[PDB]
């Protein structure tokens, strides 16, 4: 979402440092899922857990997670919403129910729901201010970050076909 704005932020970031969210997910399956990334083996994206139900068709727990920004740099936080090909696929992965995701901060609030009918992951992003807490509410179809990002030193994001 707002892909160009986000891309530009990275283009001038100076580079990315990573830091764990510190999120413990008891009772939630976070195992490799997609074959699409077979190049490194059959697994999901390296740093973002799908948070599938512990077993197929099982209900997803209503989770509340919160992350306080420990540092003086704003945190770039990304989360995904999984759009299934069909209702049956969503049910298998996250159980039956009205899937709703809410993300909140001191200056942000947005709700999301997946729309079945096409396989896709929608990534959404937020810049979290220092001393603030990002609150997440999960009802399933939420691909959670394991780590967040911090920016270091004003890079130049060039798009080019030339050799180095």
């Amino acid at each position, epitope marked *: 979402t707002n892909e160009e704005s986000l891309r530009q932020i990275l283009r001038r970031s100076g580079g990315i440092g990573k830091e764990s969210m510190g999120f413990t997910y008891s*009772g939630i399956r976070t195992n490799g899922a997609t074959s699409a990334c077979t190049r490194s083996g059959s697994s999901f994206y390296a740093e973002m857990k799908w948070l599938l139900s512990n077993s197929d068709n099982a*209900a*997803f727990p209503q989770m509340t997670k919160a992350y306080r920004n420990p540092r003086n740099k704003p945190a770039l936080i990304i989360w995904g919403v999984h759009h299934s090909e069909s209702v049956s696929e969503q049910t298998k992965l996250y*159980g039956s*129910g009205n899937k709703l995701i809410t993300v909140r901060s001191s200056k942000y609030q947005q709700s999301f729901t997946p729309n079945p009918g096409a396989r896709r992951i929608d990534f959404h992003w937020l810049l979290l201010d220092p001393n603030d807490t990002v609150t997440f509410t999960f009802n399933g179809a939420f691909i959670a970050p394991d780590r967040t990002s911090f920016f270091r030193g004003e890079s130049l994001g060039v798009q080019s076909d030339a050799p180095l």
Partner: antibody
Framework: VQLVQSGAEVKKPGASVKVSCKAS????????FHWVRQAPGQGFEWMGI????????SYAQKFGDRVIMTSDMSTSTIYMELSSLRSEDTAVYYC?????????????????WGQGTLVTVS | EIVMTQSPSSLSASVGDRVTITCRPS??????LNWYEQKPGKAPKLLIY???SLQSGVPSRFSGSGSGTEFTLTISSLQPEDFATYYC?????????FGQGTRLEI
């Protein structure tokens, strides 16, 4: 302070049932509410959870697509709709106000229970 | 899901007696166990949570401990008030599950 429930109902098989609970005192946005079945002399069965902040729901596969929960903030009502009733659905249905304590698993803490509504299907 | 059992399913006991009730889960529920009191024809009430923290308003007679795959609940010096059916709850994973119930009788 209280959760109170609608009177007992009798339904024919294949029909739907709506069970209502009303909350008095505290606001609904601070708590999650669960529906739990008290089978007639058998153990408890979790039906599902509703988050009144946005009406999000999650249901156990045992009930699957048969259950639709919704909330009404203007009347403080948590009514649930169950479809395709069977003789096995005869039970006492409880509304529970669960405090969000178990942040590790999203687990419920049943702080306050409703009166319970007896639903008979036959 | 996770399946567990209570022990014992029922007791015969008198006032002033000490009672211990336990739960044995199929897999670790590290500390995620609640205990409830149910009186016949009525809704259950929370007694203790997180396998060690008492709910407000609960008398000192009740306490508990345990972890992993062994959890305990103890009642000291039984009063007439305490003759009820006690239930476990596993908050570990979905779907959430409850115990068989342990009834106190004389």
């Amino acid at each position: 302070v209280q959760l109170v429930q609608s009177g007992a109902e009798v339904k024919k098989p294949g029909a739907s049932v709506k069970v209502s609970c009303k909350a008095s005192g505290y606001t609904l946005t601070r708590y999650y509410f669960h529906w739990v079945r008290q089978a007639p002399g058998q153990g408890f069965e979790w039906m599902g959870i509703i988050n009144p902040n946005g009406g999000g729901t999650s249901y156990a596969q045992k009930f699957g697509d048969r259950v639709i929960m919704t909330s009404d903030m203007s009347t403080s009502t948590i009514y649930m709709e169950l479809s395709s009733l069977r003789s096995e659905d005869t039970a006492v249905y409880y509304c529970a106000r669960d405090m969000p304590y178990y942040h590790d698993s999203g687990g419920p803490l049943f702080d306050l229970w409703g009166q319970g509504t007896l639903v008979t299907v036959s | 899901e996770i399946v567990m059992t209570q022990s014992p399913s029922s007791l015969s006991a008198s006032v002033g007696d000490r009672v211990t009730i336990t739960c044995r889960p199929s897999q670790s529920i590290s500390t995620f166990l609640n205990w409830y009191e149910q009186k016949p024809g009525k809704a259950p009430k929370l007694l203790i949570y997180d396998a060690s923290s008492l709910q407000s308003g609960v008398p000192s007679r009740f306490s508990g401990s345990g972890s992993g795959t062994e959890f305990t609940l103890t009642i000291s010096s039984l009063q007439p008030e305490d003759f009820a059916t006690y239930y476990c709850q596993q908050s570990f994973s979905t779907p959430y599950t409850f115990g068989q119930g342990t009834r106190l009788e004389i």
